[PDB]
Amino acid sequence: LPEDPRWELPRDRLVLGKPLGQVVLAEAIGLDKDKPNRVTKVAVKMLKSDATEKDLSDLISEMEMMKMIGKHKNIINLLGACTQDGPLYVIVEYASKGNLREYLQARRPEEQLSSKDLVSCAYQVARGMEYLASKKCIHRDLAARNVLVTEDNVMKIADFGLPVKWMAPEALFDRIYTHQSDVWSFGVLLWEIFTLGGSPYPGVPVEELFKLLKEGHRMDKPSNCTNELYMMMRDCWHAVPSQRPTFKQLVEDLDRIVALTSNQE
Numbered sequence: 684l685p686e687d688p689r690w691e692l693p694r695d696r697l698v699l700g701k702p703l704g705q706v707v708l709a710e711a712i713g714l715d716k717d718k719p720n721r722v723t724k725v726a727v728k729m730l731k732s733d734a735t736e737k738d739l740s741d742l743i744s745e746m747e748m749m750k751m752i753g754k755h756k757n758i759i760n761l762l763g764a765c766t767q768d769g770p771l772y773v774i775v776e777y778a779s780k781g782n783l784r785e786y787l788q789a790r791r792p793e794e795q796l797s798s799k800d801l802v803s804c805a806y807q808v809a810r811g812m813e814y815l816a817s818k819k820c821i822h823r824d825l826a827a828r829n830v831l832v833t834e835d836n837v838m839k840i841a842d843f844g845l846p847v848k849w850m851a852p853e854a855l856f857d858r859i860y861t862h863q864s865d866v867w868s869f870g871v872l873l874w875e876i877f878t879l880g881g882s883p884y885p886g887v888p889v890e891e892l893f894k895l896l897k898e899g900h901r902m903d904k905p906s907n908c909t910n911e912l913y914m915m916m917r918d919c920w921h922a923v924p925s926q927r928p929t930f931k932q933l934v935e936d937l938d939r940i941v942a943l944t945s946n947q948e
């Protein structure tokens with residue numbers, strides 16, 4: 684494995700901690716060459732014990748793609764790597780509050796989220812995707828499980844450099860993935876937000892779903908969701924991919940809704 688000094692961190696600067704789920708929590712000493720006695724909590728990905736050449740080359744590809752995508756506050760960013768003195772470690776931002784799906788579920792009547800919190804969560808995820816889309820990145824598996832939440836409740840898209848129930852019909856039938864299918868997935872994600880982590884299409888057997896969808900079946904409005912946000916979901920689920928809003932447009936619409944949503948409802 685060849686070295687890349689723009690990202691290399693010496694292996695002894697990383698104190699490995701607990702498993703996160705392979706991914707471990709760790710402390711990086713002097714990650715910022717400016718502030719060299721500072722420790723920063725980071726997440727580190729490395730290979731499993733019985734892991735194949737394929738697994739290795741995918742880890743590297745994911746890393747290489749992360750290098751190219753550049754930084755955004757609403758995605759999980761690359762921070763460094765140890766590639767030399769032993770096993771490959773890929774170092775990324777740590778999100779202390781875990782994934783959004785579990786974050787939401789734990790806050791069903793851990794503390795209540797306001798309506799404004801919920802819309803602002805959607806906004807942030809949309810911003811992340813707007814960025815990824817602007818860099819011509821197609822996610823393919825956008826879902827609340829693939830958003831992570833920081834200590835400061837910043838939402839960050841996960842696993843963007845690499846379930847049927849989040850796939851646009853044209854992804855579902857023809858394996859055609861586009862920015863537009865990701866928008867479909869975002870509509871499902873919106874629905875997850877406003878059900879506080881609900882299971883999509885409850886009781887619908889997977890094998891029935893594409894038929895149901897081609898037929899025009901769509902999820903009902905969550906019990907506590909405005910008509911406005913439900914129409915956004917529905918728009919994301921336009922049968923015709925061209926007719927769905929862009930992430931650009933969703934960001935603008937959500938920004939306006941956030942601003943009109945009080946901290947008190």
Ligand SMILES: COc1cc(OC)c(Cl)c(N2Cc3cnc(Nc4ccccc4)nc3N([C@H]3CCN(C(=O)/C=C/CN(C)C)C3)C2=O)c1Cl
Pocket residue numbers: 703704706726727728745746759773774775776777778779780781782785828831840841842843844
């Ligand atoms: C190349 O490495 C990457 C690339 C990534 O996206 C391009 C991502 Cl998202 C990761 N992350 C980064 C990451 C950051 N922060 C956490 N925090 C955390 C996880 C679980 C519990 C508490 C905090 N995790 C990250 N992980 C995974 C590690 C397991 N994750 C889960 O969402 C696990 C859910 C199961 N649940 C019961 C804990 C996210 C990752 O896989 C890593 Cl390590």
